[PDB]
Amino acid sequence: SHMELYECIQDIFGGLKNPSVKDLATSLKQIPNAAKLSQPYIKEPDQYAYGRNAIYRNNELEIIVINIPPNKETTVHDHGQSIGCAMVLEGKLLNSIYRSTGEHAELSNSYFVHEGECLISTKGLIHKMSNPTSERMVSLHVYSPPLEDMTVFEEQ
Numbered sequence: 001s002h003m004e005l006y007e008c009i010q011d012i013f014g015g016l017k018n019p020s021v022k023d024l025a026t027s028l029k030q031i032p033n034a035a036k037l038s039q040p041y042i043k044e045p046d047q048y049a050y051g052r053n054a055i056y057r058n059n060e061l062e063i064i065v066i067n068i069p070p071n072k073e074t075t076v077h078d079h080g081q082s083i084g085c086a087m088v089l090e091g092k093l094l095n096s097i098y099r100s101t102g103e104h105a106e107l108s109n110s111y112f113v114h115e116g117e118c119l120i121s122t123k124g125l126i127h128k129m130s131n132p133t134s135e136r137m138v139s140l141h142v143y144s145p146p147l148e149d150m151t152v153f154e155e156q
């Protein structure tokens with residue numbers, strides 16, 4: 001069995017029923033050199049400041065490939081009601097946590113996650129992903145359930 005990406009996704013993410021942020025984190029880590037399999041699903045920034053490519057979906061979860069060019073960031077957001085886990089494939093990102101504070105949001109914590117490492121995005125959590133490095137950052141995300149309505153905040 002010489003696995004291709006979608007082949008791995010079905011084999012790992014397809015039978016999940018109500019998975020936890022750690023169920024998702026260990027399943028992402030179960031992908032064989034996910035970095036190579038991920039290409040060529042990586043895309044250049046179209047509508048967003050970052051490349052975003054939805055590549056899998058069911059009633060349970062949703063998988064997207066994200067590409068944050070050097071010195072680019074996402075918005076400050078929550079994932080509606082579906083959690084997310086991501087794994088930086090190649091690159092290094094700064095994940096900033098935000099504190100709920102009205103209609104705007106204040107920075108609460110911040111840290112880096114490197115290739116092969118994941119970021120957990122529990123329910124209600126508000127964050128921002130940026131790329132301070134001079135190289136691009138490619139990430140493999142999983143949301144459960146699929147994102148329905150994220151709310152973008154206007155920070156402190």
Ligand SMILES: [Fe+3]
Pocket residue numbers: 077079084121127
């Ligand atoms: Fe996010």
